[PDB]
Amino acid sequence: MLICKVLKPLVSTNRIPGFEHKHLQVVLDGSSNKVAVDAVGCKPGDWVICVGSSAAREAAGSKSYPSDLTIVGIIDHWDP
Template sequence: MNIMRVVRDLVTTHRVSGLHARQLRVLEDAKGNIEVAVDAVGARAGDFVITIAYSSARIATGDPRVTTDLTIGGIIDDWNEDKFTGRIPAAS
């Protein structure tokens, strides 16, 4: 599992049938890498989330027939930018 931030929704007009009608989100990791994930929990832009990868990602959607290798499995309630990037906050 990894912690990532939801950047935005991803809307597709055509997709393989294995994705069904699942919501897709664009995610960014702490290094700025971008990935697309199936959203199984209803995350919104700006949310920090826990992702589930590889074959477990299919199971996390609730339907192992969904063709994905990255699924959002949870929304993090208490997380901030400094924890995400590893930056030390400035002294106040």
């Protein structure tokens, strides 16, 4: 899955399905920026793990959920 260091939070905007979007967080995979829904914890961010694809939908909570990438877990011992 995408290794991903949390970078910063987001701000709301004029979309309707944000009821389930649940505070998107800008993360980084080591190359550039990205944003994924925070499921469990983002913090400043040491090292967490991010899941996308269609799994993201049921990874975020719904089959019809509109996402391409969701954070799924935290790596306690992280990785350099």
